[PDB]
Design a protein around this ligand. Structure first.
Ligand SMILES: Nc1ncnc2c1ncn2[C@@H]1O[C@H](COP(=O)(O)OP(=O)(O)NP(=O)(O)O)[C@@H](O)[C@H]1O
Ligand SMILES: Nc1ncnc2c1ncn2[C@@H]1O[C@H](COP(=O)(O)OP(=O)(O)NP(=O)(O)O)[C@@H](O)[C@H]1O
Ligand SMILES: O=C1c2ccccc2Nc2ccc(F)cc2N1Cc1ccccc1
Ligand SMILES: O=C1c2ccccc2Nc2ccc(F)cc2N1Cc1ccccc1
Ligand SMILES: [Mg+2]
Ligand SMILES: [Mg+2]
Lengths: 295, 300
């Protein structure tokens, strides 16, 4: 509705490449409101290839859906520009994606942060399930860091408009089946990424051979910091039978309980020197970079 | 809790935005320790106060400014007392409302002007609830977060440290009395600034002559776009009897009433296309730079 803004190409500018994925390239950009002098930082995603205006109508229809999400842990699509190559606008996250964040702060991340991130990602996916929106490309690279205390899911629904083998449920690899329960499989891999501080899953195994090892019962290994309870949640996300996997609602509760006693469920060297920010640092971050309400 | 104490090594001044009577404001960057991000901030290096102040006294006063909670009042965010007194607040890329109205002279619709009057009155009424006297209210001390959302700034600076004769109530000029009712006078001048698109009040008249012309009953003239209804509000703000002036609570009500029929109370050429932004453009502004939501815009 009024949730998605249609932008003129003349009101924004690319200033820096942030990266590229399977579906396009993301830029740091500036929005210049017409008739104003200000330059507002934004993220711009230029799709991999140019689309006909017939295809644009379909891109537009789904863009309205993605612009309609309202949840503190889900990124909302903000605008679109229907140039020959479609350009999409969302809020710029200066901290980048959670995968890069955990790699940059490897070891230096306390159990309180890791478990809270699992809670927040589960909340965002539970919301998407409520909307009947299947992500299809959940991974640590598609969780953005708004502040170190507040992460948000991005890039949902993109994959079905326009293949991350090592994050997909077996049935998605074999039969192109994508459901909320196959998203749960990808959730488990995302948690594994966090708990290993950004390790590549199935490192050294060709993607063409992942489905065979999954059929034989092979799974991602137990991260060194994960207790039996944390790793069992992850293993349950990877059950062959999709209906045997946990619900995102169940995951919220499980990780919330664990986050109330983090040192019991993650064993991290020097965890006693790491910290969840002080109310002083929490208020400062919010006023500067995060004024949306959240738990 | 509310006021962050900063190390000088976690922020840097980048550019002067301007200076007033109380210090210099910079566009700056906050660099969280152990992080790689650089977050734009506003940094104000205060000049020296005319009275001696201990570090604790400065901190105690800063905490009061950090404790305000209202959508139309800027909150002090951080402080660094090593070098000079340096304060950190949110950077407003649109700048102050005075510069904004001058920059969009004759291009501003009645809904914007009247809603700004509502929002400033709301912020001042909150400050009055907290017993905080501004002493330096003016269009330059209303900041634009978005064109739809303005916020009062720089309250309390004048009493912490050491000029704005043309914005001060008569009792402030003559006897240095500063109250919430003298703030109402300055509010009246601020409204006059907006309605004249940023004209200098008493232009070409020395400040030494302001009290004389006020005592003789002369006031700032009626802005061309103002109906008498709006101009009467300004005149009431400038009554010699301080207790006779409107209360900020009354100003909220009156200007909110006018904003429900904006073209009835302001006469602006081409006013019909200068409406408040569409729900599409409001959501875009809010998501990008104003997640505080509460624009507080009463609409025709
Ligand atoms: N809103 C954003 N703010 C800041 N950085 C972003 C934003 N969106 C994406 N990025 C980054 O831009 C780069 C490109 O992301 P993207 O194009 O989605 O590829 P990807 O997420 O790594 N792989 P995939 O999404 O599965 O195709 C990544 O480094 C992201 O972390
Ligand atoms: N938070 C802010 N974000 C952006 N610009 C700001 C901010 N605070 C102040 N400024 C601007 O920085 C300049 C310096 O402001 P300031 O030092 O308060 O002088 P002044 O407000 O014009 N006069 P006065 O406050 O009465 O002494 C002005 O151009 C302001 O508009
Ligand atoms: O590409 C997309 C995107 C495009 C079309 C349909 C769904 C999509 N999924 C999505 C969901 C929420 C969000 F907030 C951003 C996206 N994005 C990523 C994006 C968009 C603009 C700028 C940078 C990145
Ligand atoms: O100086 C001050 C300020 C300093 C001391 C006491 C009161 C003060 N009043 C005030 C109130 C709210 C606000 F949000 C900012 C201020 N400011 C202005 C400022 C601070 C940091 C950077 C730029 C400008
Ligand atoms: Mg992505
Ligand atoms: Mg000022």
């Amino acid at each position: 509705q009024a949730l998605l803004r249609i932008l003129k190409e003349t009101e924004f500018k690319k200033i820096k490449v942030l990266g590229s994925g399977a579906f396009g390239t993301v830029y740091k950009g500036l929005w210049i409101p017409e008739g104003e002098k200000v330059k507002i930082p934004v993220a711009i995603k230029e799709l991999r290839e140019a689309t006909s205006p017939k295809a644009n109508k379909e891109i537009l229809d789904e863009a309205y859906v993605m612009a309609s999400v309202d949840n503190p842990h889900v990124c909302r699509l903000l605008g679109i520009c229907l140039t020959s190559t479609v350009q999409l606008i969302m809020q710029l996250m200066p901290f980048g994606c959670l995968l890069d964040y955990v790699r940059e702060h490897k070891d230096n991340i306390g159990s309180q942060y890791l478990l809270n991130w699992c809670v927040q990602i589960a909340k965002g996916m539970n919301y998407l399930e409520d909307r009947r929106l299947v992500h299809r490309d959940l991974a640590a690279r598609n969780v953005l860091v708004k502040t170190p205390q507040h992460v948000k899911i991005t890039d949902f629904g993109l994959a079905k408009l326009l293949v991350p083998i090592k994050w997909m449920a077996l049935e998605s690899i074999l039969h192109r089946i994508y459901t909320h329960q196959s998203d749960v499989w990808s959730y488990g891999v995302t948690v594994w990424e966090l708990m290993t501080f950004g390790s590549k899953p199935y490192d050294g195994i060709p993607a063409s051979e992942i489905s065979s090892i999954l059929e034989k019962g092979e799974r991602l290994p137990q991260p060194p910091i994960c207790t039996i309870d944390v790793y069992m949640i992850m293993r349950k996300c990877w059950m062959i039978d999709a209906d045997s996997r946990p619900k995102f609602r169940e995951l919220i509760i499980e990780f919330s309980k664990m986050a109330r006693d983090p040192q019991r469920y993650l064993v991290i060297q020097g965890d006693e020197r790491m910290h969840l920010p002080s109310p002083t640092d929490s208020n400062f971050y919010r006023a500067l970079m995060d004024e949306e309400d959240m738990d």
